[PDB]
Design a protein around this ligand. Structure first.
Ligand SMILES: C[C@]1(c2cc(NC(=O)c3ncc(Cl)cc3Cl)ccc2F)N=C(N)CO[C@H]1C(F)(F)F
Length: 378
């Protein structure tokens, strides 16, 4: 670890929208805001006008553009885009001070992909080539950056979040000691596709959810800066909501609150954080039979929703059909180290996380936990 002073505070976002970093593409450099997504593996940028884009990548104005003469078509569950592959020179101005040639998906058509008012014009997929489109031979941006420079094979994310635009830091090539307090605890990257991890125990205010730990990782668990919610498999979600309801029973909320469909509001400044429980996930450690525990607050899983005398919030723990997703609701408590070189993900208490005078997010260990390999879904 050390000081990476140029990359501190290089992330921005609209509350409720994703975190982006400024990048440049082409010669002379064209500036774009790029969504930071550890849940995907393509670098793709708007490259034709769109009602939601106020600027885009103009290939004909870049002397260093090279046309791969191949298309790429990418449908998601919600939304889709189509693009033309090529390469160009790419920099991150508040970044590692190096310029690399990378594959770029130039997006020429799209539907429900760009978000009105989000202020980003492309997406930086930071996961591994296995899930790149159209196939794993399309080298992702971070793979190219490391191969072409001496940047260490690691990046770290501090997503700060709101209580006003949000901010944070993406440290490319290192770990900035000023962005966390306490110890960094590492969990193995189980497999290099998404950033897949293994959860071995779940507590609500210290009360064990008491499920077969395989349920926590069915069919996977990933760390995803491109998702807001903490998303839990159906059986785990139902158990967690029941327990969170009971711990907060001093106040009653309509069923639609717990489904994320309705806001809950309190008089400005009187949100009763202390009646809601903390949520702890225990992650497999690097040592045989050891785990560690990360703990978030209601300040993370109750999302502020602004509107021009009340503070109103949406519940941001929701049901998944594709395994656990540790999204911004998890990441905003922590400084998260994606240590690709050593195949591990580090968590430490974030120096910017939102909390109150009496409770803080936490990272603690070690805990004796047996048969942790049985928690992984084959
Ligand atoms: C590819 C994908 C994706 C994610 C986003 N994320 C956001 O906009 C966002 N990010 C962070 C926060 Cl805090 C809030 C928001 Cl609202 C946007 C476009 C996009 F294409 N990446 C994922 N990891 C999961 O969703 C995927 C899906 F395609 F299905 F949308």
């Amino acid at each position: 670890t050390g000081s990476f002073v140029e990359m501190v505070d290089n992330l921005r976002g609209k509350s409720g929208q994703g975190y982006y970093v400024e990048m440049t593409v082409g010669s002379p450099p064209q500036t774009l805001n790029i969504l930071v997504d550890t849940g995907s593996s393509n670098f793709a940028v708007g490259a034709a006008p769109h009602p939601f884009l106020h600027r885009y990548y103009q290939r004909q104005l870049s002397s260093t553009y090279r046309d791969l003469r191949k298309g790429v078509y990418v449908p998601y569950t919600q939304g889709k885009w189509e693009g033309e592959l090529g390469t160009d020179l790419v920099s991150i101005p508040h970044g590692p001070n190096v310029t690399v040639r990378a594959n770029i998906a130039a997006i020429t058509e799209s539907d429900k992909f760009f978000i009105n008012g989000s202020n980003w014009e492309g997406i930086l997929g930071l996961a591994y080539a296995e899930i790149a489109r159209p196939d794993d031979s399309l080298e992702p941006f971070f793979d190219s950056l490391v191969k072409q420079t001496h940047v260490p094979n690691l990046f770290s994310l501090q997503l700060c979040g709101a209580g006003a635009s949000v901010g944070g830091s993406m440290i490319i090539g290192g770990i900035d000691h000023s962005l966390y307090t306490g110890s960094l605890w590492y969990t193995p990257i189980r497999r290099e596709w998404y950033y897949e991890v293994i959860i071995v125990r779940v507590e609500i205010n210290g009360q064990d959810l008491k499920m077969d730990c395989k349920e926590y990782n069915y069919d996977k668990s990933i760390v995803d800066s491109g998702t807001t919610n903490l998303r839990l498999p159906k059986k785990v979600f139902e158990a967690a909501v029941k327990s969170i309801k009971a711990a907060s029973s001093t106040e009653k909320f309509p069923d639609g609150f717990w489904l994320g469909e309705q806001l809950v509001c309190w008089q400005a400044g009187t949100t009763p954080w202390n009646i809601f429980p903390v949520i702890s996930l225990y992650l497999m450690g690097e040592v045989t039979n050891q785990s560690f525990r990360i703990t978030i607050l209601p300040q993370q899983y109750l999302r502020p929703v602004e509107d021009v005398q009340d503070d109103c919030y949406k519940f941001a723990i929701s049901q998944s059909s594709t395994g656990t997703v540790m999204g911004a609701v998890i990441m905003e408590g922590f400084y998260v180290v994606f240590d690709r070189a050593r195949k591990r993900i580090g968590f430490a208490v974030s120096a910017c996380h939102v909390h109150d005078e009496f409770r803080t997010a936490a990272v603690e260990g070690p805990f004796v936990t047996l048969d942790m390999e049985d928690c992984g879904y084959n």
